[PDB]
Design a binder for this molecule. Structure first.
Ligand SMILES: [Ca+2]
Ligand SMILES: [Ca+2]
Length: 167
C-alpha cells in the first residue's frame, strides 16, 4: 500500500529526493527488538523525521556506524516533543538475545524492529536486501528524502535530517 520506487542506475551510493518527487511508504512495522510482542510502526512517530537503518551485529560497517546513529538519534530527539528518531531494522541476527545484548553493551537508545529475514525490504521499493547497512531518511510525512547505501556519519545524515525537522 505504498508508491515509493527506488532506482540508482549510475552506481551512486546516495540518492536525494526533492520534495515534489517524494513518494509514500506503507505503515512499516514489526516486532520490537527489546520488547517481544509489541509492534513498532512508522505511525507511532507521526510528524517526526524517521531515520530507518538496516543493521546486524554481524556486520562490520554497522558496528562502526553504531556511535554515529546514537548521536543522530540524540540530536533529532532534541530537535524541533521529539523532532525525529532513529528506527533500526535488525536483520540476519537469528538470535534475539545476541542483538539485544549488542544494543545494551553499546548504549544504543533508539528502537529497532526485529526482522531476521529482512521482510521489510519488500516495502522499501527495490532497495536490495543485500545492502546492509542502508539508511533511509524519511521526512515528517514519512516519505523518503534520502537513501544511503553505505555506512554514514552523523554529519551526512543530520545535514539532510535537521532541515526536515524545521520545515
Ligand atoms: Ca501499535
Ligand atoms: Ca526496540
Amino acid at each position: 500500500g505504498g508508491t515509493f520506487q527506488f532506482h540508482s542506475p549510475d552506481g551512486k551510493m546516495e540518492i536525494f529526493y526533492d520534495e515534489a518527487d517524494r513518494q509514500q511508504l506503507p505503515d512499516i512495522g514489526g516486532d520490537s527488538l527489546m520488547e517481544e510482542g509489541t509492534q513498532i510502526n512508522l505511525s507511532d512517530f507521526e510528524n517526526q523525521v524517521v531515520i530507518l537503518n538496516a543493521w546486524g551485529q554481524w556486520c562490520a560497517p554497522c558496528r562502526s556506524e553504531s556511535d554515529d546513529l546514537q548521536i543522530i538519534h540524540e540530536e533529532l530527539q532534541a530537535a524541533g516533543t521529539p523532532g525525529g528518531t532513529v528506527l533500526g531494522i535488525n536483520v540476519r541476527d537469528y538470535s534475539r538475545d545476541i542483538a539485544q545484548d549488542f544494543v545494551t553493551d553499546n548504549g544504543l537508545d533508539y528502537p529497532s524492529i526485529y526482522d531476521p529475514p529482512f521482510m521489510t525490504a519488500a516495502s522499501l521499493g527495490g532497495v536490495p536486501a543485500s545492502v546492509i547497512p542502508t539508511t533511509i531518511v524519511l521526512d515528517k510525512q514519512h516519505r523518503p528524502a534520502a537513501v544511503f547505501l553505505r555506512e554514514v556519519t552523523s554529519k551526512d545524515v543530520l545535514d539532510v535530517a535537521l532541515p526536515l525537522v524545521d520545515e
